[PDB]
Amino acid sequence: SPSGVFTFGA
Amino acid sequence: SPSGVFTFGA
Amino acid sequence: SPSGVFTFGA
Amino acid sequence: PIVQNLQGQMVHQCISPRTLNAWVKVVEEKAFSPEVIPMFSALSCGATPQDLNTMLNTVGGHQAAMQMLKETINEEAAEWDRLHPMREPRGSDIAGTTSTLQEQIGWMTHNPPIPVGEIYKRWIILGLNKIVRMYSPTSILDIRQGPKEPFRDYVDRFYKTLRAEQASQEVKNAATETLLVQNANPDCKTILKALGPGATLEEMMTACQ
Amino acid sequence: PIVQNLQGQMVHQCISPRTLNAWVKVVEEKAFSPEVIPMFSALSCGATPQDLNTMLNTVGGHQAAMQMLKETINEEAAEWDRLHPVHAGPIAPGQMREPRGSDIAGTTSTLQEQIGWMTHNPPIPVGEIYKRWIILGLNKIVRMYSPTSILDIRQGPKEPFRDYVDRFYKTLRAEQASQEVKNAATETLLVQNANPDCKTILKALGPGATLEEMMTACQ
Amino acid sequence: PIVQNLQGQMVHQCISPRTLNAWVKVVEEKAFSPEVIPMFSALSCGATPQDLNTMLNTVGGHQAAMQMLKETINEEAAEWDRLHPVHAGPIAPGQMREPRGSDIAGTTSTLQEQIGWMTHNPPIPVGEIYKRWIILGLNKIVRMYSPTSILDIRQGPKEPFRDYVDRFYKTLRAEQASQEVKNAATETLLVQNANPDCKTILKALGPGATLEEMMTACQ
Amino acid sequence: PIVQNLQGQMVHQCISPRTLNAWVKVVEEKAFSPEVIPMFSALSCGATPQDLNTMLNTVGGHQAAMQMLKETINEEAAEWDRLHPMREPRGSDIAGTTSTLQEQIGWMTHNPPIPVGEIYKRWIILGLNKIVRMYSPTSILDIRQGPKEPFRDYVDRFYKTLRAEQASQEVKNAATETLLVQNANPDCKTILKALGPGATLEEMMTACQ
Amino acid sequence: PIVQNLQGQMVHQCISPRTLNAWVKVVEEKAFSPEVIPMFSALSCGATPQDLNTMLNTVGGHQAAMQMLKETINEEAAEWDRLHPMREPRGSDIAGTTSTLQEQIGWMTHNPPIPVGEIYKRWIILGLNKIVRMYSPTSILDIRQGPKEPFRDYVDRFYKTLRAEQASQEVKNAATETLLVQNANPDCKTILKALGPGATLEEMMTACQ
Amino acid sequence: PIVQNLQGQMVHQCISPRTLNAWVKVVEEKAFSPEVIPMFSALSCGATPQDLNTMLNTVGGHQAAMQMLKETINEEAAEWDRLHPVHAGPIAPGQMREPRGSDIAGTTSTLQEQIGWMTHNPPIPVGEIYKRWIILGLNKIVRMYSPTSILDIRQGPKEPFRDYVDRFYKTLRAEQASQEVKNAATETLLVQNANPDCKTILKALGPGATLEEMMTACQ
Numbered sequence A, B, C: 001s002p003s004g005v006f007t008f009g010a
Numbered sequence D, G, H: 001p002i003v004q005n006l007q008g009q010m011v012h013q014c015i016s017p018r019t020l021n022a023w024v025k026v027v028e029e030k031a032f033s034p035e036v037i038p039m040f041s042a043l044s045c046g047a048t049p050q051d052l053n054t055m056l057n058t059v060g061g062h063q064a065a066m067q068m069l070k071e072t073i074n075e076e077a078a079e080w081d082r083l084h085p086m087r088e089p090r091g092s093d094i095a096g097t098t099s100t101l102q103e104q105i106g107w108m109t110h111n112p113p114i115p116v117g118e119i120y121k122r123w124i125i126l127g128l129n130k131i132v133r134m135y136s137p138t139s140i141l142d143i144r145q146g147p148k149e150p151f152r153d154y155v156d157r158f159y160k161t162l163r164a165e166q167a168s169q170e171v172k173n174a175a176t177e178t179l180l181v182q183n184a185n186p187d188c189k190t191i192l193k194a195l196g197p198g199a200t201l202e203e204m205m206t207a208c209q
Numbered sequence E, F, I: 001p002i003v004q005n006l007q008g009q010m011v012h013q014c015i016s017p018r019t020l021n022a023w024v025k026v027v028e029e030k031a032f033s034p035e036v037i038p039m040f041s042a043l044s045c046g047a048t049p050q051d052l053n054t055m056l057n058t059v060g061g062h063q064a065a066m067q068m069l070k071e072t073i074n075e076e077a078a079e080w081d082r083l084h085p086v087h088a089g090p091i092a093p094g095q096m097r098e099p100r101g102s103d104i105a106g107t108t109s110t111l112q113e114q115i116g117w118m119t120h121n122p123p124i125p126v127g128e129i130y131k132r133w134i135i136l137g138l139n140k141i142v143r144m145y146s147p148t149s150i151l152d153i154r155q156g157p158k159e160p161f162r163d164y165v166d167r168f169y170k171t172l173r174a175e176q177a178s179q180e181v182k183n184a185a186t187e188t189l190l191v192q193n194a195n196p197d198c199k200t201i202l203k204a205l206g207p208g209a210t211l212e213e214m215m216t217a218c219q
Ligand SMILES: O=C(O)c1ccccc1-c1c2ccc(=O)cc-2oc2cc(O)ccc12
Pocket: E076, E080, E125, E128, E129, E132, E133
């Protein structure tokens, strides 16, 4: 599954 | 006399 | 010294 | 305008720059198209006579329409004085010519309230109706579907002009019964006459698609 | 619109200039694209019948469309009068009368009456009812304004599958005034109008495959 | 500006950036057209002398006009000192002093003094007084900036009567800094400057006809 | 959205025209670039399921992405129903398909609160992650420094694509260890290989300035 | 800024993006024209030293003017320390260099209040006066009516320059007595000299219309 | 952001669309010019770690710069864990735990935890700490993005001294991510890079002359 695009934070 | 331009409502 | 630029008021 | 505050009290607020710019730009762009009168009525919500005078006065051009509007306001004020011969408001007090802001606030917030703002807005809207009806560029009789024009556009102009002319609902219906169908181009006119009597606008626009 | 103040009381507020201009510009630019109906439903939040009539009246063009809309509103108002009739007679001194089809459309009711109906306990959402009628009329107008038919949407020879799907569900949304369009005939038509290669790929993928897998197969 | 908070108290508020930019742009675009004075009167609502001085100071151009305006303000301030002099002497421990011509123009008064004068009971509208002086000066400047004279406004040979009336009452508004211009000489001049045909029509219409009827006759 | 009022109460507010126009313009301009998902998450702050559905529905184009998003929402709702077999919310109630605004408000303001809006936003963000990862125009393997391209631009595209692909931090690090240095143009590649092992991004960008 | 809340309390508010963008765009468009100083004074209403430093620091260009302004602030802070040798604020505390936001709030809301923001804004306005007077493009002596220039424009430049130079009212009056009339083009100069002594600006502009 | 309501209570507010769009446009137009860091510091007023992460995440470009920024944040977080370690053990029933380097950066802390830390008495400004780390990273990125060197800034032959000073302190600000740059070497370099005439004038002016006097001498 994808990991996300929120470089900063969670 | 004119009737008005308020197509909707009164 | 300069006097200011506030034409109106103080 | 008079607006209710979160404490339940009716207070006075200054007319907004957003609203002023709104009305100015509406009169600039739309001239006296019918839609101008609703927008006005919506931007003057809760307005005092002074706020209405502000809105009308910020108009730069169309001074003919504004002088006509002045005359109409005078007529309605005279009729108000005839009907109706803390102070009681006269025809000049409702139009904000002889009343002060605090007096208008007093009348509007009084119990029972005296809606001077709504009366003045009524007269103003009447004058605006007259101006719009006078400024209609073309009559409904001369609204005819162009040879290469879409039917949707022809009906758009038909009912736009019909809205500008401001007739009773019976005259509008009567107009769309016969005048709408007859003024169509030969193709869509033959199709429409082939449809039948009492066809809805939806059906007519569908057939000529 | 009826909005809650900090005190916890439901009060009336003048319709905002930002909302008015918003609706006007949406009708100007988007014409009658489907997305106009959601936007409308969002800009008329907590709106009274008066405010709805303001939004509709401020529209300057598409006057034919506004006539169809008025017809639809009259039809729904008559259906309300049939299914929800008001007993002609006296009203209890403390209660408020019942709304007719003309009272919900804000044509025979004053702003204070609408406020009372919307803030009563139990409430009577006249604004939401009228908004549902308006949205029915707008649905009909959108459906009519559909430029092309779903049948005429076919994947180009050297066109990406993604673009073909975009125009597909866009045109279908326009023709049906909705996004829930997962029918067997709709799906079979999607797979059939595709170009031969991606068609064979999709057919080979099997039945009941998700749109994600279908678009992954024809990358 | 002095605005009422929800608590019911009259408090001071910093002049808004939207109002500042509004006034600035009005002075930039409209120059000194008559409609600038209403707009000003609306943007300076509930304004203190300080806020008025801010609006006037933020104007970057038309500095000559601003000098005429300053002269006018000084004249009205002197007339205030003549008609409304302040007794040189002691002030009651609980009361506030009386404003001089310099105190109303916000040049010798602090913001707190202006707040006290404007919120006292009975109030002393120093902001409205100063605003009336400013509007007198602006009236003079508008009157001076009038491009053409009403005498030089004549209906074109093939020009619509409506356009001629527009330029007529527009030019007259500029030359008089007002819209109430229903004089006998003004009306006779309106009918006289018209083209021969519409002139004969209007003369035939009779005396005392409304502008509505006059514009209807020369459609 | 549900927002706290100055009286400490949690009340319902209508979604703003500023916010609506914001989301619309973001989807228009940025398409499905990764930055679209943060912005969404920031404009839906305090949102109910109805507000989220409003935001998604006002999107005019990208109907393929919206249908995929629908499917993903259905999958997450089915999983929610499996896990979780005043009323209790079902998979359809969190997605606002079968629940009413007043019920959503009830769940969200209840004590203990049931964050239906945050759950639905979670599912939506998942679908959006899938869509973004699928819509990446180029793979990280094909991101190579042009001959006359500045190194800063090459790394900008490298980490933009790397953000769009959405891999574990170990796969991202592993990618930037070797793939970043090898794909550089001959000059900056010789310089980088001359630097040494374990050089920071700052150092690599500095050397190739 | 420190602003009064509806409860009558003096609270701290964050400087607005509207205000920031306002000041930035004013410095961009108007450079150091005199009108920039009023606008500044109007956008910093209720400002703390930290907010003033924010406003000045967001300026991208004109770094020469900003360094001069720094020097002037240092001079005024030194004079403040000489005059004035809960903590008491020093020259560095008023300029926000050595004080914290909470301390500035304390001084400004204290009773009696210590207006550090107004003092710092005073020093800043002084430095800005010096910068404006130094950046005047042309001297009043070289402001002469062009041959084909309208008199209104000539006086506009005359009093614009006269405002930029910032002299005592006696020097300004003395300038407009003789220098204004002499620098006019031959026509309007003959007319003006024909008018007489002690003519108002209104009269001079009227005669040369 | 944590903002005070009229009741006097510190409450949480959703980050505004105007602030989001503001920051985005600042990063788009100004790139990484020095003035971007003040603007950031002003747009993130009263911001939580979550809001800071929102501002940084909404940035679409300069992803390499965002990687350097993330590295810097990790470094400062490790330094926080070294200088400010949290005792592994129990927490008093009424107290809140201590933040780790991951808790300040909002990567292992919930919004409610950040609210508690920021509103506690005594408060724990996690938002201001994280903002200081972010501003360190941004300082490094600005310093790196400096186009030219201060050594290459020399007064043109027929260029005004004012323009030369503007480019001088502008380039120096970029190369040092600061405006306090009154060093002996900096000043000597300013006077040295000037054209010969203004150089002789400045040297003749004497030591310790103010920039005002220096710019007055070379008018
Ligand atoms: O169907 C309903 O929920 C209903 C029941 C009783 C009275 C009105 C409605 C009703 C609505 C109730 C709530 C609401 O938010 C919106 C409603 O809209 C209606 C529209 C109709 O044509 C006809 C009816 C409704």
